[PDB]
Structures are given as structure tokens and as C-alpha cells.
Amino acid sequence: GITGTWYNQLGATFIVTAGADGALTGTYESAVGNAESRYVLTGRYDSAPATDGSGTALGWTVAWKNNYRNAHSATTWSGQYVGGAEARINTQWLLTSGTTEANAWKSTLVGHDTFTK
Amino acid sequence: EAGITGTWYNQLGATFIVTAGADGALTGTYESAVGNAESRYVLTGRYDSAPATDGSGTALGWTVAWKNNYRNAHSATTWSGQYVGGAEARINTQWLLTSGTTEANAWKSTLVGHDTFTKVK
Amino acid sequence: AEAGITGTWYNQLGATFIVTAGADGALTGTYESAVGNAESRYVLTGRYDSAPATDGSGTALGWTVAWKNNYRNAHSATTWSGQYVGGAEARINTQWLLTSGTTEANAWKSTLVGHDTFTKVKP
Amino acid sequence: AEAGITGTWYNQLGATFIVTAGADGALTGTYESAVGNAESRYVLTGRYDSAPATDGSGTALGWTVAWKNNYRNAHSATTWSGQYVGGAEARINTQWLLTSGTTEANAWKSTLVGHDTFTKVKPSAAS
Ligand SMILES: O=C(O)CCCC[C@@H]1SC[C@@H]2NC(=O)N[C@@H]21
Ligand SMILES: O=C(O)CCCC[C@@H]1SC[C@@H]2NC(=O)N[C@@H]21
Ligand SMILES: O=C(O)CCCC[C@@H]1SC[C@@H]2NC(=O)N[C@@H]21
Ligand SMILES: O=C(O)CCCC[C@@H]1SC[C@@H]2NC(=O)N[C@@H]21
Numbered sequence: 001g002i003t004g005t006w007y008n009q010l011g012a013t014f015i016v017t018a019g020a021d022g023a024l025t026g027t028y029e030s031a032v033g034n035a036e037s038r039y040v041l042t043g044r045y046d047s048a049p050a051t052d053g054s055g056t057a058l059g060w061t062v063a064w065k066n067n068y069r070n071a072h073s074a075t076t077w078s079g080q081y082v083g084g085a086e087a088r089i090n091t092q093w094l095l096t097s098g099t100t101e102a103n104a105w106k107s108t109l110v111g112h113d114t115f116t117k
Numbered sequence: 118e119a120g121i122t123g124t125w126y127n128q129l130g131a132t133f134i135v136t137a138g139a140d141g142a143l144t145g146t147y148e149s150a151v152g153n154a155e156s157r158y159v160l161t162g163r164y165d166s167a168p169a170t171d172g173s174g175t176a177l178g179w180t181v182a183w184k185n186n187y188r189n190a191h192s193a194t195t196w197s198g199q200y201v202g203g204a205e206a207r208i209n210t211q212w213l214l215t216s217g218t219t220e221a222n223a224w225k226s227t228l229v230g231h232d233t234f235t236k237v238k
Numbered sequence: 239a240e241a242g243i244t245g246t247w248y249n250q251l252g253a254t255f256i257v258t259a260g261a262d263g264a265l266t267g268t269y270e271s272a273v274g275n276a277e278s279r280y281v282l283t284g285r286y287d288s289a290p291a292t293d294g295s296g297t298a299l300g301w302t303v304a305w306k307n308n309y310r311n312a313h314s315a316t317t318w319s320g321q322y323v324g325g326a327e328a329r330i331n332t333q334w335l336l337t338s339g340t341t342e343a344n345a346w347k348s349t350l351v352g353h354d355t356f357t358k359v360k361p
Numbered sequence: 362a363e364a365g366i367t368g369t370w371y372n373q374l375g376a377t378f379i380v381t382a383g384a385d386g387a388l389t390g391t392y393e394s395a396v397g398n399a400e401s402r403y404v405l406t407g408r409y410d411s412a413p414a415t416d417g418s419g420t421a422l423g424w425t426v427a428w429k430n431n432y433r434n435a436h437s438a439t440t441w442s443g444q445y446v447g448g449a450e451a452r453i454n455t456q457w458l459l460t461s462g463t464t465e466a467n468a469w470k471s472t473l474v475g476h477d478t479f480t481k482v483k484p485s486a487a488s
Contacts, residue, residue, distance in 0.1 A: 023161070043180045046217065047184065048189060049217055053220075055217045055223075057191055058182065059182070059194070060180060061162045061179060063164055063165050063176060063177070063178070064165075065141065065167060073165070073176045074164070092227055094195070097176060099173055
């Protein structure tokens with residue numbers, strides 16, 4: 001149910017394949033911030049979830065370097081896939097930029113993204 | 118390689134074994150001493166393979182889904198942070214732990230915290 | 239629509255937030271949750287920017303509830319941090335942290351995080 | 362209210378946190394930051410659990426600063442959420458959210474997250 005092409009409330013394009021082992025692999029493209037064109041992603045998901053109506057746990061990471069640009073930063077998304085006639089992936093995320101140790105207290109942004117097919 | 122590649126330990130007694138590839142990949146295993154977890158779990162992630170040379174740390178992140186051959190907690194953690202080199206190198210992080218829940222219980226699905234890793238001991 | 243932070247507000251979880259914004263920056267009022275280890279109303283206090291920018295920016299604010307009243311005590315506290323938007327509708331967008339008291343061995347799992355959006359028109 | 366949470370507290374970033382805990386559950390006082398767009402003292406208010414568990418658990422609490430005083434305005438607010446742990450090495454252990462006001466287009470980057478630990482013993486340094 002997870003494999004396919006997804007979009008969020010910020011105009012992003014999330015392309016991902018879920019392997020039978022628990023792997024997540026694919027590409028991320030952001031419409032905002034210090035970013036252009038596509039970026040590599042990798043993560044993990046629960047391949048035998050509970051059967052009681054609970055969602056399926058997952059996560060993935062992007063490091064914001066590619067052939068066109070390097071922002072010296074990385075985002076991780078943590079959340080759950082909820083199946084159904086209108087499938088969704090609901091997340092919260094942490095964006096850390098590299099800093100001097102004197103600026104380390106302001107290194108990390110927090111937010112939330114919702115994805116649909 | 119040297120630097121991030123190695124065996125790391127946090128303040129909760131975890132053992133984090135990782136390899137950093139020249140292509141920006143992180144690969145390895147994670148063992149937790151706390152929570153609904155037993156033995157080792159697979160991890161994967163990414164890092165900046167060309168950091169700034171102005172004294173800044175190196176940005177990185179990784180994910181564990183808590184299922185292996187011993188048990189399954191129906192959950193996953195992501196760690197987001199930076200690597201700082203030198204005589205007392207560290208990896209400094211914040212994390213999000215999401216558990217699978219019904220819709221009505223989604224407001225209490227996610228724990229947040231902070232872990233510091235060192236290569237000593 | 240009715241402008242101003244002072245008023246009666248509802249979130250996407252069934253909660254009610256009743257607040258007054260004072261001229262010096264203070265927030266005072268009550269909070270009622272429809273989920274968790276809670277019943278009836280609880281005291282809150284907080285702060286807001288009483289002279290915000292006017293370049294399209296929202297108004298920054300925050301408040302705290304400790305989950306003890308005359309009916310129940312959950313031994314926990316939540317803080318909400320966010321901004322009053324000030325666009326075409328009355329809306330406040332927030333992120334929150336809920337910490338429960340724990341022993342030291344359980345402190346790693348002490349804190350939940352999430353996001354609530356509040357509107358004067360019940361959603 | 363005269364001891365415990367009440368007192369002068371210091372964190373790992375050089376801040377000074379001066380607070381009084383009332384019998385009624387209230388927190389009142391001043392906060393001074395040594396980093397960021399901030400100068401001199403700011404007003405704070407918050408709440409704590411005035412009847413905590415007796416099994417050895419910490420005391421739950423939270424407070425807010427809006428970063429406006431007579432000297433400057435950063436158009437932002439921070440909330441700290443955490444617990445008080447008493448003893449010879451008493452601490453207040455916290456996680457925090459700092460929201461800046463932004464346009465609707467930039468709302469995705471409005472909020473910083475971190476963690477502060479406070480002690481009643483003033484750090485040594487430096488002159
Ligand atoms: O600015 C950077 O350092 C890199 C681009 C960051 C984009 C962020 S990741 C979280 C959020 N969701 C998106 O689709 N874009 C932003
Ligand atoms: O209980 C679970 O659902 C799985 C085990 C969670 C262990 C967490 S991950 C964050 C923190 N750091 C650790 O080393 N262990 C805990
Ligand atoms: O169970 C508790 O410890 C006390 C009640 C907590 C309810 C939380 S506060 C964050 C979220 N928003 C709501 O309106 N309710 C929940
Ligand atoms: O830059 C601003 O907008 C206001 C100053 C923010 C300072 C922060 S609050 C969290 C952290 N702890 C401190 O003692 N200082 C910083």
C-alpha cells in the first residue's frame with residue numbers, strides 16, 4: 001500500500017518503493033527552501049503491522065546534497081501509513097542544519113506533513 | 118572510511134554500529150537497552166558527504182523500524198542531528214518515536230527526546 | 239469573523255480554549271480537553287507579543303496547563319507554542335509538548351509531541 | 362513556594378531563570394537569555410502540579426516567555442515543558458518550542474525545537 005507517488009500540503013513530490021523486507025527507497029523533491037530538483041531517500045517500515053485497525057509505522061531521511069546544490073542539512077520524517085479508500089501518510093519531521101558548536105541550540109526545525117496519492 | 122563509521126554508545130546504554138558510504142549512505146544495526154526491544158535491528162539513513170569547511174558539524178539522520186526475529190513493537194524511531202569530529206567526537210541528536218495507533222488515538226502516537234553518542238566504551 | 243486573540247476557541251480534537259489577552263502581554267483563561275486523563279475545566283496562563291510586526295507576519299504566543307483541578311490529577315503538564323494568523327479567518331496554529339512526571343528510569347519516555355489548530359468557528 | 366521549584370536557576374547556555382511557585386499552582390518570575398535576539402530580563406508565567414505522586418516521580422511543570430521588553434522585540438515566544446527532580450543535585454529537565462511570527466508562506470520554517478537542563482549551582486567562570 002506504501003509503494004507509489006505521493007504529494008504533501010507544501011507541493012512536494014515523494015516517490016517511494018517498499019521492499020518485502022522492510023526497506024524504503026526512492027526520491028524526494030521539495031517546492032520550498034534551499035533545494036532544487038530530486039534528492040535520494042532511504043528508510044524503514046513495519047512489514048507485519050497489527051490487525052486491530054492500527055496504522056503502519058515508518059520513517060525516512062533526506063540529506064540535502066545532489067548534483068546541483070548542497071544545503072548542509074538533513075530532514076527525517078516519522079509517522080504512520082493509514083490505509084483505506086483515501087490512503088494517507090501522517091508525519092512529524094526534524095530538520096537539522098550543520099552549525100558551529102556556539103550556534104548548536106538553533107540547529108533544528110520541527111513541523112508536520114500530510115501525504116496523499 | 119573514518120569519522121562517522123564506527124561503533125557508538127548513548128546515555129541509555131544503546132549500541133549503534135554504522136558504516137558511512139562515499140555515496141552518502143548510512144547502513145548498520147541498532148540495539149536498545151530500554152523499551153519493547155530485544156537484540157539487533159536493521160537501520161538505514163543518509164549524511165552530508167561534503168560538509169562546510171568553516172568549523173560546522175556534518176548533518177545526518179537514520180531510521181529503525183522495531184521488528185526483527187524476536188519481537189515486533191509496531192513502531193519506528195528517526196534520529197536527526199550532526200556529527201562533530203576531533204579528540205572527543207560526538208553525534209548529537211533529537212528523535213521522534215511513532216507508534217501505530219487507531220485514528221481516535223493518533224494524538225498520543227509520538228514521543229520526542231534527545232540522545233548523545235560517543236565512541237568510548 | 240471576529241478579530242483579536244481574546245475569545246472562545248475550538249481545536250480539531252473537541253477541546254475548548256477560553257482566553258483573555260491583557261494590554262501588557264498576559265494570557266489568562268481555561269482549557270477543557272475531550273481526550274486523555276482529564277475532565278471539566280483547568281486553569282491556564284501564558285504570554286503574547288503585544289506589538290507584532292505588520293509585514294504579513296502572524297502574532298507569536300504560548301500558554302501552559304497543569305492537569306490538576308478539583309475533580310482529577312494526571313500528574314502532567316502541556317505547553318502550546320504558536321501564532322495567531324490574522325488572515326481572512328480567526329485561526330491560531332500550534333505545536334505542543336506534554337510531559338508526565340516519571341521516575342528517572344522512565345524519563346526517556348516522558349514527553350509526547352503533536353500539533354493543534356484552533357478556530358472561533360467550531361470545525 | 363519558599364523552597365523547591367522556587368529559587369534562581371541556570372542552564373547550559375548561560376541563562377538566568379528567577380521563579381516563584383505559589384501555593385495555588387502558579388509560576389511567576391523573570392528570564393534572561395545569553396544567546397539569540399534578546400537583551401536584559403523578560404516576564405514569564407506558567408503552571409506546576411502542586412500535589413505530585415509520592416512514588417518517587419518528578420513534578421510536572423511548564424512556562425512561557427514572549428520576547429518583548431522595554432529594550433527590544435524579536436516577535437517570537439518560547440515554551441518550556443518538563444519536570445522538577447529534588448535532592449542534593451536538584452534539576453529542572455526540559456524540552457522547548459520557539460515559534461517566530463511569519464507570513465503564511467514561510468510558516469513551515471517558523472518553529473525551532475531543543476532541550477535545556479537547569480541547576481541551582483552557578484557555573485564556575487571565569488574571572
Ligand atoms: O532548506 C533546506 O535546508 C532544505 C530544504 C528543506 C525543505 C523542508 S523538509 C520539511 C518540509 N517539507 C517539505 O516538503 N519541504 C520542507
Ligand atoms: O518501545 C519501543 O516501541 C521500541 C524501543 C524504543 C527505544 C527508544 S528509541 C529512542 C531512545 N533511544 C534509545 O537508545 N532507546 C530509546
Ligand atoms: O492525559 C493527560 O495527561 C492530560 C490530558 C492531555 C490532553 C492532550 S493536551 C494535547 C492534546 N490536545 C488536546 O486538546 N488534548 C490533548
Ligand atoms: O532569538 C529569539 O527569538 C529570542 C531569544 C531565544 C533564546 C532561546 S529560548 C531557548 C534557548 N534557551 C536559552 O536559554 N536561550 C535560547
